[PDB]
Design a protein around this ligand. Structure first.
Ligand SMILES: C[S@@+](CC[C@H](N)C(=O)[O-])C[C@H]1O[C@@H](n2cnc3c(N)ncnc32)[C@H](O)[C@@H]1O
Ligand SMILES: C[S@@+](CC[C@H](N)C(=O)[O-])C[C@H]1O[C@@H](n2cnc3c(N)ncnc32)[C@H](O)[C@@H]1O
Lengths: 204, 206
């Protein structure tokens, strides 16, 4: 509610208004990379610090957790990060085709039961939404430790016709140049459970 | 001594497979689907599958005659009549089968050839994928198990690049509910290691 209003510079209260004008909000034409399901915001803050020449937008359905995320963006003074308290279905209300250059998905809600397939952020509907905002010059960068979700996601990507250009089935034992760990990633890393990673892009 | 053993057991190990191209149903005495395995090895998998699925006809191919001898003996030891073995490489598959004659291709713990210059020796590289298409047409599938993370990672990208559809994927087969999974010789060793077994099913887009 009212700590968001106070930090309305980082947390945009009316994101529909900047559809086709996100460059003005950032004051440059640096590529815009979004994250769907930011959570506490460790990943978006690290990536912001690491890549000053990319503009980051985090979207999170819960205000309770997006609050922790604005604090992390306020704490590291990264000026290249904004946060939206919106649902993934409103993405098309907020972005014109080609305005987004890349979509990050990090440890998304698995919804493992068949009947809840359409809640999964890798389901074809959400894939179409990412296409609408990237056109076909986009990519999706996905990591999770959930075996069921990754295996579902691989099938989903394949079914939609996306091209798999990167896949790790044990990310921590793969050569990552500057992979920023998410909150979830740091917990599961200790476990020895493998972290799954895919890059998919639209076929030219 | 391998050549002579194969000669005495020519009923199971077909010495001239090109001669049966388009007529494999006559060799089996039925129109049951023919599933093939490229890289049979010692033949545990194909013997188990034969015995489990008497309504499927199985053909194993193995380049090494050293190991295909062990495979003949396992096929002889289990009196499965729905299995033949060919001592041929994967390139020769088109000389042996007409399009659609093969319904399914099994790949089991194939040589990983990890270095970039050896990509073309990998049984999931686009050239071999083209060969499987030639013998299955576009109503086939490829059933693939391996313990090698590098090879599975590469294979997923290869399948995707060729335009195949991924319809099943397990990243931990032994902790997945698989009904009638037949372990290969290599698979049984790795099952006891906590090492995960990777499985994909991939089919042609229609
Ligand atoms: C399990 S948490 C992972 C958080 C963070 N990415 C990490 O890896 O540490 C997944 C997040 O996705 C968010 N989420 C799920 N569906 C969403 C949607 N449609 N729109 C926005 N956020 C969503 C959830 O609220 C939750 O915060
Ligand atoms: C890892 S070894 C044995 C694996 C065995 N199938 C298993 O899973 O237990 C794979 C086998 O495939 C054979 N092979 C390799 N390329 C082949 C080809 N083009 N045609 C037939 N067999 C081949 C190798 O010689 C080797 O015996």
């Amino acid at each position: 509610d009212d700590f968001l209003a106070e930090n309305a510079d980082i947390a945009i209260s009316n994101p529909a208004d900047y559809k086709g004008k996100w460059n003005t909000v950032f004051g440059n034409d640096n590529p815009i990379h979004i994250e769907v399901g930011t959570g506490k915001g460790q990943f978006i803050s690290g990536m912001a610090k690491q890549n000053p020449d990319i503009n980051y937008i985090g979207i999170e359905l819960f205000k309770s957790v997006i609050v922790t995320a604005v604090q992390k963006v306020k704490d590291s003074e990264a000026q290249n990060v904004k946060l939206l308290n919106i649902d993934a279905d409103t993405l098309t209300d907020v972005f014109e085709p080609g305005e987004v250059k890349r979509v990050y998905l990090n440890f998304s809600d698995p919804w493992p039961k068949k009947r809840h397939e359409k809640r999964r952020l890798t389901y074809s509907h959400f894939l179409k939404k990412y296409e609408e905002v990237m056109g076909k010059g986009g990519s999706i960068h996905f990591k999770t430790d959930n075996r069921g979700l990754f295996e579902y996601s691989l099938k989903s990507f394949s079914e939609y016709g996306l091209l798999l250009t990167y896949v790790s089935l044990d990310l921590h034992n793969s050569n990552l140049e500057g992979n920023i760990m998410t909150e979830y990633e740091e917990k599961f890393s200790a476990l020895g459970q493998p972290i799954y990673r895919a890059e998919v892009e639209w076929r030219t």
